[PDB]
């Protein structure tokens, strides 16, 4: 199947900065998202094949792709409920049942990814999307980076989960700092603290995910079978 622009109706922008559009496949009338990347803008600053070997309930599906002279087009699952980031601003912070449920969906997604030995880098709330039943979907830079990626993998996803849980429950990442260099010091020396409201089970989990020595971070199964997790997700 060789797709083209003329195959889809186009509506409003959804994304921004390296351009995704609401779209509709003209014949079946199916709503989806079209990412229009600029080749030139990439002869500047594959892998769409790793993405097409993937099928998971919490990874954004890639339905196909095409290109013309200047542009590469990705035909993507449209997440009707928007970004987790949007929801965090709307909600301020998430409850534990909601947080734990997102952590489980992430960690499932990440098992499967590691199982097809795909390893994602840093997950940020803006890269997390929300399906029609509000199930999560996966799709400066500092705040999410682990020590390894800043100082002098597969455990870097444990760290990401850990920043995320923290961000979900408190409404802020744990290393937010007045400056790029302060954040570097905080992350790099693992300097963060919890507001008093964060419960014991959540500290234990986040505490374990956020050790500086990777090989002391839990395994994905341990996150999945974590008592705070298995207690709180639906
Ligand atoms: O290149 C990008 C960046 C990117 C942006 C998006 C993106 C952005 C927004 C949406 C949306 C979407 N739904 C919304 C509803 C309300 C407001 C905004 C929304 N964005 N659905 N699917 C999306 C997908 N995905 N990926 N991802 C990518 C690349 C290759 C393979 C792959 F699986 C993902």
Short mmCIF file of C-alpha atoms and ligand atoms in Angstrom, two decimals:
data_model
loop_
_atom_site.label_atom_id
_atom_site.label_comp_id
_atom_site.label_asym_id
_atom_site.label_seq_id
_atom_site.Cartn_x
_atom_site.Cartn_y
_atom_site.Cartn_z
CA UNK A 1 0.00 0.00 0.00
CA UNK A 2 1.64 3.27 -1.18
CA UNK A 3 -0.11 6.21 0.48
CA UNK A 4 -0.09 9.89 -0.54
CA UNK A 5 -1.22 13.29 0.92
CA UNK A 6 -4.20 13.32 -1.38
CA UNK A 7 -5.39 10.18 0.46
CA UNK A 8 -6.24 12.16 3.62
CA UNK A 9 -8.39 15.20 4.58
CA UNK A 10 -6.48 17.58 6.83
CA UNK A 11 -7.70 19.55 9.83
CA UNK A 12 -6.04 21.48 12.64
CA UNK A 13 -2.42 21.26 13.98
CA UNK A 14 -2.12 19.14 17.13
CA UNK A 15 1.60 19.12 17.88
CA UNK A 16 4.21 21.78 17.26
CA UNK A 17 8.01 21.87 16.62
CA UNK A 18 9.63 18.82 14.99
CA UNK A 19 3.90 19.54 12.99
CA UNK A 20 1.25 16.90 13.46
CA UNK A 21 -2.25 17.32 12.06
CA UNK A 22 -5.62 15.86 12.64
CA UNK A 23 -6.44 13.86 9.51
CA UNK A 24 -8.96 11.63 7.93
CA UNK A 25 -8.39 8.80 5.45
CA UNK A 26 -10.77 9.85 2.65
CA UNK A 27 -12.35 6.47 1.85
CA UNK A 28 -13.05 4.88 5.21
CA UNK A 29 -13.37 8.28 6.92
CA UNK A 30 -11.03 7.14 9.72
CA UNK A 31 -9.58 9.86 11.94
CA UNK A 32 -5.78 9.68 12.53
CA UNK A 33 -2.73 11.96 12.82
CA UNK A 34 -0.30 12.99 10.08
CA UNK A 35 3.20 14.01 11.12
CA UNK A 36 4.76 16.06 8.33
CA UNK A 37 8.55 16.02 8.79
CA UNK A 38 10.84 18.03 6.51
CA UNK A 39 13.67 16.10 4.90
CA UNK A 40 15.78 19.21 4.32
CA UNK A 41 15.15 20.13 8.01
CA UNK A 42 16.74 16.67 8.67
CA UNK A 43 19.65 16.78 6.17
CA UNK A 44 20.34 19.41 8.85
CA UNK A 45 20.20 18.61 12.62
CA UNK A 46 14.77 2.96 9.30
CA UNK A 47 13.58 3.26 12.94
CA UNK A 48 10.21 3.78 11.32
CA UNK A 49 10.74 0.03 10.75
CA UNK A 50 11.34 -0.77 14.43
CA UNK A 51 8.14 1.20 15.01
CA UNK A 52 6.13 -0.83 12.48
CA UNK A 53 7.19 -4.18 14.03
CA UNK A 54 5.44 -2.95 17.19
CA UNK A 55 1.95 -3.64 18.37
CA UNK A 56 1.08 -2.72 21.90
CA UNK A 57 -2.05 -1.24 23.56
CA UNK A 58 0.13 1.52 25.15
CA UNK A 59 2.41 2.37 22.28
CA UNK A 60 1.14 4.76 19.57
CA UNK A 61 0.68 2.69 16.43
CA UNK A 62 2.32 3.73 13.21
CA UNK A 63 -0.13 2.77 10.41
CA UNK A 64 2.27 3.45 7.56
CA UNK A 65 4.25 6.27 5.98
CA UNK A 66 5.21 8.04 2.76
CA UNK A 67 7.37 10.80 1.45
CA UNK A 68 7.44 13.34 -1.28
CA UNK A 69 10.33 15.52 -2.50
CA UNK A 70 10.66 17.59 0.66
CA UNK A 71 8.62 15.77 3.21
CA UNK A 72 8.31 12.52 5.09
CA UNK A 73 4.77 11.76 6.42
CA UNK A 74 3.92 9.47 9.30
CA UNK A 75 0.41 8.08 9.54
CA UNK A 76 -0.24 7.72 13.21
CA UNK A 77 -2.80 6.66 15.71
CA UNK A 78 -4.78 9.73 16.90
CA UNK A 79 -5.06 9.87 20.67
CA UNK A 80 -8.45 11.49 21.24
CA UNK A 81 -7.82 12.57 24.82
CA UNK A 82 -4.56 14.51 24.21
CA UNK A 83 -1.27 14.75 26.14
CA UNK A 84 -0.61 13.71 29.78
CA UNK A 85 1.09 17.08 30.11
CA UNK A 86 -2.12 18.88 29.23
CA UNK A 87 -3.91 16.78 31.83
CA UNK A 88 -1.37 17.57 34.52
CA UNK A 89 -1.87 21.31 34.02
CA UNK A 90 -5.67 20.77 34.07
CA UNK A 91 -5.54 18.49 37.09
CA UNK A 92 -2.48 20.07 38.90
CA UNK A 93 -1.44 16.64 40.11
CA UNK A 94 -2.78 13.11 39.77
CA UNK A 95 -4.17 10.83 42.48
CA UNK A 96 -2.41 7.56 43.34
CA UNK A 97 -4.89 5.31 41.54
CA UNK A 98 -4.46 7.34 38.35
CA UNK A 99 -0.68 7.64 38.79
CA UNK A 100 -0.20 3.93 39.57
CA UNK A 101 -2.31 3.01 36.59
CA UNK A 102 -0.17 5.13 34.26
CA UNK A 103 3.00 3.67 35.77
CA UNK A 104 1.70 0.14 35.09
CA UNK A 105 0.75 1.04 31.50
CA UNK A 106 4.24 2.56 31.01
CA UNK A 107 6.02 -0.42 32.54
CA UNK A 108 4.05 -2.92 30.49
CA UNK A 109 4.90 -0.87 27.38
CA UNK A 110 8.50 -0.87 28.44
CA UNK A 111 8.66 -4.69 29.10
CA UNK A 112 7.44 -5.31 25.58
CA UNK A 113 9.84 -2.72 24.21
CA UNK A 114 12.79 -4.32 26.04
CA UNK A 115 11.47 -7.76 24.94
CA UNK A 116 11.70 -6.63 21.33
CA UNK A 117 14.93 -5.07 22.65
CA UNK A 118 13.79 -1.55 21.90
CA UNK A 119 14.99 0.82 24.57
CA UNK A 120 13.43 4.26 24.88
CA UNK A 121 15.42 7.21 26.18
CA UNK A 122 13.70 9.82 28.33
CA UNK A 123 9.93 9.82 28.47
CA UNK A 124 8.38 13.22 29.16
CA UNK A 125 4.78 13.94 29.94
CA UNK A 126 4.42 15.82 26.63
CA UNK A 127 5.30 12.66 24.77
CA UNK A 128 2.65 10.67 26.52
CA UNK A 129 -0.77 10.50 24.98
CA UNK A 130 -4.20 9.47 26.04
CA UNK A 131 -6.46 6.96 24.27
CA UNK A 132 -10.24 7.14 24.06
CA UNK A 133 -10.60 5.18 27.33
CA UNK A 134 -7.86 7.37 28.90
CA UNK A 135 -5.26 4.63 28.63
CA UNK A 136 -1.79 5.99 28.14
CA UNK A 137 0.12 5.77 24.91
CA UNK A 138 3.87 6.20 24.39
CA UNK A 139 5.27 8.28 21.46
CA UNK A 140 15.56 22.02 28.56
CA UNK A 141 16.10 18.31 28.12
CA UNK A 142 17.65 17.90 31.57
CA UNK A 143 14.82 17.09 33.96
CA UNK A 144 14.23 13.58 32.66
CA UNK A 145 17.85 12.58 32.01
CA UNK A 146 19.54 10.14 34.34
CA UNK A 147 23.01 10.60 35.90
CA UNK A 148 24.67 8.33 33.24
CA UNK A 149 23.34 10.45 30.37
CA UNK A 150 24.77 13.66 31.86
CA UNK A 151 27.94 12.85 33.86
CA UNK A 152 31.33 11.54 32.60
CA UNK A 153 21.59 1.41 29.40
CA UNK A 154 18.25 -0.39 30.01
CA UNK A 155 17.99 0.82 33.58
CA UNK A 156 17.48 4.40 32.27
CA UNK A 157 13.77 3.53 31.84
CA UNK A 158 13.60 2.81 35.58
CA UNK A 159 14.86 6.32 36.22
CA UNK A 160 12.31 7.75 33.77
CA UNK A 161 9.51 5.93 35.48
CA UNK A 162 10.77 7.37 38.71
CA UNK A 163 10.83 10.97 37.61
CA UNK A 164 7.40 10.42 36.08
CA UNK A 165 5.72 8.94 39.19
CA UNK A 166 7.13 11.77 41.15
CA UNK A 167 5.93 14.34 38.58
CA UNK A 168 2.47 12.70 38.39
CA UNK A 169 1.92 12.74 42.15
CA UNK A 170 3.39 16.15 42.97
CA UNK A 171 2.73 18.04 39.73
CA UNK A 172 6.45 18.87 39.37
CA UNK A 173 9.58 16.94 38.49
CA UNK A 174 11.85 16.33 41.45
CA UNK A 175 14.94 18.14 40.14
CA UNK A 176 13.34 21.36 38.93
CA UNK A 177 15.91 24.03 39.56
CA UNK A 178 16.51 27.73 39.06
CA UNK A 179 19.05 26.92 36.23
CA UNK A 180 20.42 24.27 33.86
CA UNK A 181 23.51 23.92 36.13
CA UNK A 182 21.53 23.59 39.37
CA UNK A 183 19.45 20.83 37.80
CA UNK A 184 22.70 19.12 36.72
CA UNK A 185 23.92 19.18 40.33
CA UNK A 186 20.60 17.95 41.74
CA UNK A 187 20.22 15.10 39.30
CA UNK A 188 23.91 14.27 39.42
CA UNK A 189 23.96 14.13 43.26
CA UNK A 190 20.38 12.80 43.46
CA UNK A 191 19.20 15.74 45.52
CA UNK A 192 15.38 15.79 45.79
CA UNK A 193 12.74 15.63 48.48
CA UNK A 194 9.04 14.69 48.86
CA UNK A 195 6.15 16.95 49.94
CA UNK A 196 4.65 15.50 53.12
CA UNK A 197 1.52 14.26 51.30
CA UNK A 198 3.43 11.64 49.26
CA UNK A 199 2.63 8.28 50.91
CA UNK A 200 5.11 5.69 52.24
CA UNK A 201 4.57 3.17 49.43
CA UNK A 202 5.07 5.84 46.77
CA UNK A 203 8.31 7.12 48.41
CA UNK A 204 9.64 3.62 48.59
CA UNK A 205 9.01 3.05 44.87
CA UNK A 206 10.28 6.44 43.67
CA UNK A 207 13.15 6.15 46.14
CA UNK A 208 14.19 2.84 44.62
CA UNK A 209 13.81 4.00 41.00
CA UNK A 210 15.88 7.11 41.77
CA UNK A 211 19.23 5.56 43.03
CA UNK A 212 22.36 6.93 41.25
CA UNK A 213 23.84 3.49 40.68
CA UNK A 214 21.71 1.97 37.92
CA UNK A 215 22.27 -1.61 39.04
CA UNK A 216 20.47 -0.69 42.29
CA UNK A 217 17.24 0.30 40.47
CA UNK A 218 14.40 -2.23 40.46
CA UNK A 219 13.59 -4.48 37.52
CA UNK A 220 10.37 -3.79 35.55
CA UNK A 221 8.69 -6.87 37.11
CA UNK A 222 9.39 -5.45 40.58
CA UNK A 223 7.75 -2.17 39.63
CA UNK A 224 4.81 -4.22 38.19
CA UNK A 225 4.55 -6.32 41.37
CA UNK A 226 5.27 -3.33 43.68
CA UNK A 227 2.79 -3.30 46.53
CA UNK A 228 1.98 0.40 46.00
CA UNK A 229 1.52 -0.32 42.33
CA UNK A 230 -0.56 -3.53 42.67
CA UNK A 231 -2.60 -1.82 45.33
CA UNK A 232 -3.50 1.28 43.33
CA UNK A 233 -3.88 0.65 39.59
CA UNK A 234 -7.24 -0.56 38.15
O1 LIG B 1 7.92 11.63 15.53
C1 LIG B 1 7.23 11.57 16.54
C2 LIG B 1 6.76 12.84 17.31
C3 LIG B 1 5.26 12.65 17.54
C4 LIG B 1 4.27 13.54 17.72
C5 LIG B 1 3.22 12.71 17.80
C6 LIG B 1 1.90 12.92 18.06
C7 LIG B 1 1.42 14.10 18.59
C8 LIG B 1 0.07 14.24 18.93
C9 LIG B 1 -0.79 13.24 18.74
C10 LIG B 1 -2.12 13.14 18.94
C11 LIG B 1 -2.90 14.07 19.49
N1 LIG B 1 -4.19 13.93 19.88
C12 LIG B 1 -4.56 15.09 20.48
C13 LIG B 1 -5.71 15.49 21.00
C14 LIG B 1 -5.84 16.76 21.61
C15 LIG B 1 -4.73 17.63 21.61
C16 LIG B 1 -3.54 17.15 21.01
C17 LIG B 1 -3.49 15.91 20.49
N2 LIG B 1 -2.46 15.25 19.90
N3 LIG B 1 -2.50 11.90 18.60
N4 LIG B 1 -1.42 11.25 18.14
C18 LIG B 1 -0.36 12.08 18.21
C19 LIG B 1 0.95 11.92 17.87
N5 LIG B 1 3.71 11.46 17.75
N6 LIG B 1 4.80 11.43 17.58
N7 LIG B 1 6.80 10.42 17.05
C20 LIG B 1 7.04 9.28 16.43
C21 LIG B 1 7.94 9.10 15.36
C22 LIG B 1 8.08 7.84 14.76
C23 LIG B 1 7.33 6.77 15.24
C24 LIG B 1 6.44 6.95 16.32
F1 LIG B 1 5.62 5.85 16.89
C25 LIG B 1 6.30 8.20 16.90
#
